[PDB]
Design an enzyme around this catalytic site. Sequence first.
Site, PDB file in Angstrom:
ATOM      1  N   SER A  45      40.966  15.543  71.778  1.00  0.00           N
ATOM      2  CA  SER A  45      42.288  15.835  71.205  1.00  0.00           C
ATOM      3  C   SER A  45      42.050  17.285  70.594  1.00  0.00           C
ATOM      4  O   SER A  45      43.365  17.919  70.161  1.00  0.00           O
ATOM      5  CB  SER A  45      42.744  14.855  70.144  1.00  0.00           C
ATOM      6  OG  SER A  45      43.342  13.510  70.838  1.00  0.00           O
ATOM      7  N   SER A 105      48.535  13.114  66.873  1.00  0.00           N
ATOM      8  CA  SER A 105      47.660  13.004  68.360  1.00  0.00           C
ATOM      9  C   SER A 105      48.282  12.367  69.283  1.00  0.00           C
ATOM     10  O   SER A 105      47.503  11.642  70.126  1.00  0.00           O
ATOM     11  CB  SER A 105      46.233  12.596  67.962  1.00  0.00           C
ATOM     12  OG  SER A 105      45.263  13.167  68.590  1.00  0.00           O
TER      13      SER A 105
HETATM   14  C1  LIG Z   1      42.344  12.811  70.954  1.00  0.00           C
HETATM   15  O1  LIG Z   1      40.970  12.740  70.930  1.00  0.00           O
HETATM   16  N1  LIG Z   1      42.483  11.316  71.323  1.00  0.00           N
HETATM   17  C2  LIG Z   1      44.318  11.028  71.025  1.00  0.00           C
HETATM   18  C3  LIG Z   1      44.262  10.311  69.784  1.00  0.00           C
HETATM   19  N2  LIG Z   1      43.602  10.863  68.749  1.00  0.00           N
HETATM   20  O2  LIG Z   1      43.865  10.365  67.694  1.00  0.00           O
HETATM   21  C4  LIG Z   1      42.890  10.925  66.365  1.00  0.00           C
HETATM   22  F1  LIG Z   1      43.581  12.207  66.275  1.00  0.00           F
HETATM   23  C5  LIG Z   1      41.473  10.981  66.882  1.00  0.00           C
HETATM   24  O3  LIG Z   1      41.132   9.767  67.579  1.00  0.00           O
HETATM   25  O4  LIG Z   1      40.805  12.139  66.617  1.00  0.00           O
HETATM   26  C6  LIG Z   1      43.178   8.930  69.926  1.00  0.00           C
HETATM   27  C7  LIG Z   1      43.627   7.703  69.290  1.00  0.00           C
HETATM   28  C8  LIG Z   1      42.096   9.199  70.904  1.00  0.00           C
HETATM   29  C9  LIG Z   1      41.765  10.323  71.653  1.00  0.00           C
HETATM   30  C10 LIG Z   1      41.747   9.800  73.177  1.00  0.00           C
HETATM   31  N3  LIG Z   1      40.530   9.722  73.641  1.00  0.00           N
HETATM   32  O5  LIG Z   1      42.705   9.977  73.847  1.00  0.00           O
END
Ligand SMILES: *C(=O)N1C[C@H](NO[C@H](F)C(=O)O)C(C)=C[C@H]1C(N)=O
Length: 263
Positions: A45, A105
Amino acid sequence: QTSAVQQKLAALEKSSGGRLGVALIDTADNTQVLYRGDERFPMCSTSKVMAAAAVLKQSETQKQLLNQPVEIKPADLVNYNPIAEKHVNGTMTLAELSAAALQYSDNTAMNKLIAQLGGPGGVTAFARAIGDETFRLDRTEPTLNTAIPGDPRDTTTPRAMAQTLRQLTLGHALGETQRAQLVTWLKGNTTGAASIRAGLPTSWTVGDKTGSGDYGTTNDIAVIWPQGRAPLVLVTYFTQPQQNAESRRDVLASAARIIAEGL
Ligand SMILES: *C(=O)N1C[C@H](NO[C@H](F)C(=O)O)C(C)=C[C@H]1C(N)=O
């Protein structure tokens, strides 16, 4: 050479079982501290910063772009969509998508930013236009988070990401109003209190973007306004050998604490 700070980061890494990447730029003197700074890590992310910045750059020549509506359909929802799911069968503006991507996110929001840039390669092309020869985005959400060891897709290095975050937030890669908007969005992040900021004095102001993915990948990229001195940029990337490994935000906090103690 190896500095005291690098030795401490190596001890942290050895106790963690994973692989840690760190890059600091201290804008008080432009000096750097690096740990695995030229090794590639999956961004997860944290790549949302580059996509949101690339749409801000497009908005410099289109005053109404951030108010442009984008349709959200059921088919668009992916693995984590808390803002976009409220707007299924409706619209969100490119500003709302940028805010949702950066501050909550939201992965559907990220996919709309990528589509506005013409696909993953449009994000990479923006990175190249602002001097980042390292960053690559190859896939959309959610598959950009597979984080497979050795896979170059959707990776960058700590050194490159710190440089780019500096130029985006503190330098002139964006126009002044767009830089201020990106900084406001990062400062309003909801997901960061356990990561870099948990390792820093409480009086310091942070804007950040986290990421996580498979292989226990746990990331944070931050701009930091320390009490009493010029801003810092800090990148902390962490990934583990087993696909199902647990998140380790505490490792990022420990890396930040070591960096702060070393100032
Ligand atoms: C990004 O890494 N994502 C989107 C989302 N991020 O949420 C927080 F910011 C974080 O985890 O850093 C989630 C829940 C997971 C990841 C992903 N693997 O999609």
